[PDB]
Amino acid sequence: DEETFEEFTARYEKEFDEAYDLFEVQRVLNNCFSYDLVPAPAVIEKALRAARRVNDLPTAIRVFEALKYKVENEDQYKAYLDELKDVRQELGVPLKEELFPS
Amino acid sequence: VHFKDGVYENIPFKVKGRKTPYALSHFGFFAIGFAVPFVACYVQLKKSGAF
């Protein structure tokens, strides 16, 4: 398997637009986070807009939870939360730390 | 040949619905296994005149 990073985003962007129920959105999301890379910000945005279209809020919360496991530092987690600022605000998605604050 | 299906049906021994407790069968079976080396020792030490 010789797939460049640019080919990775353009293929999973196409794969999030075709998912037609909850099983499909969760199965595609599982395979996207199972490689040796963190998906690009433009892939995360299409995964949030796919869970809105099937009307499921917990799947959109878990997207950012997996993001904080896969990064290497906590400053890589921050820079994602600063790119996807409008989308998390426009759809009304909270963070798991914000929802169950400790 | 047609047999039955279920939980306690694919084993040769009875575990439920029996008069005697199943503990007498389970631990009696493994006691006899553990006890055959000692029967051999008894016969042979009774042949050497040690007993």
Binding site: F33, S34, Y35, D36, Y69 | -
Partner: protein, 236 residues
């Protein structure tokens, strides 16, 4: 020369053959410790970090670089220690220019020794049997299951050929501190060589299950000086 309580190593060496056996054991254990260090470390640091990994890397199924590399690496290590292991094999098999030959014959629970070089002043065969001292007859200070009623006397700094056979069943002539171990089979004669570099008493045992008395058939060897050996030989 004698085993000691709670010992975890070779008995002290008296011949160049046992010097070389120990050198090969230590050389091999250098590389078996590198390999055990790797495997135990990879095992430990994989359980401690991936027992807490929530997303498995299910798309990693092969690698061409590592699989070729880890097929070649064990071959280099195996070849490194085969070089001195072949040299020691042919250095111990040679028996060149010995100065005396002794025969040892195994019996149902005793040994037997024969000298037939006819060097003694009267030119006969010197021969005797060796028996373990029974427990009821031991004198205080003697060693249980080791001390015998007669022993084999050899001189120091002399090359010796041993000839070993048996009478009834298989036995085994073995002395740990001399680097000697050879089966004693009814029908054939095997040989071994030795050269002892210091004086003392060296103990051994039978090493081929021979029946009820397999544990009661020890070997005891005394090494003395040359003038002292000729006096012992010329009497017994």
């Amino acid at each position: 020369d004698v085993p000691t309580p709670y010992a975890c190593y070779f008995q002290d060496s008296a011949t160049p053959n046992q010097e070389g056996i120990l050198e090969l054991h230590d050389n091999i254990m250098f590389y078996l410790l590198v390999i055990l260090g790797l495997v135990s470390w990879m095992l430990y640091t994989i359980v401690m970090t991936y027992s807490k990994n929530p997303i498995a890397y299910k798309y990693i199924k092969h690698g061409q670089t590592i699989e070729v590399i880890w097929t070649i690496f064990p071959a280099v290590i195996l070849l490194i220690i085969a070089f001195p292991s072949f040299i020691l094999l042919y250095l111990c098999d040679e028996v060149i220019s010995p100065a005396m030959t002794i025969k040892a014959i195994g019996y149902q629970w005793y040994w037997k020794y024969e000298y037939s070089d006819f060097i003694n002043d009267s030119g006969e065969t010197v021969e005797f049997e060796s028996y373990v001292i029974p427990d009821e007859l031991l004198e205080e200070g003697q060693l249980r299951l080791l001390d015998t009623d007669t022993s084999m006397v050899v001189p120091v700094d002399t090359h010796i050929r041993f000839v070993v056979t048996a009478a009834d069943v298989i036995h085994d002539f073995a002395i740990p501190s001399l680097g000697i171990k050879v089966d004693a089979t009814p029908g054939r004669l095997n040989q071994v060589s030795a050269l002892i570099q210091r004086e003392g008493v060296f103990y051994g045992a039978c090493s081929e299950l021979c029946g009820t008395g397999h544990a009661n058939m020890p070997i005891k060897i005394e090494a003395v000086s040359l003038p002292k050996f000729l006096e012992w030989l010329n009497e017994q």
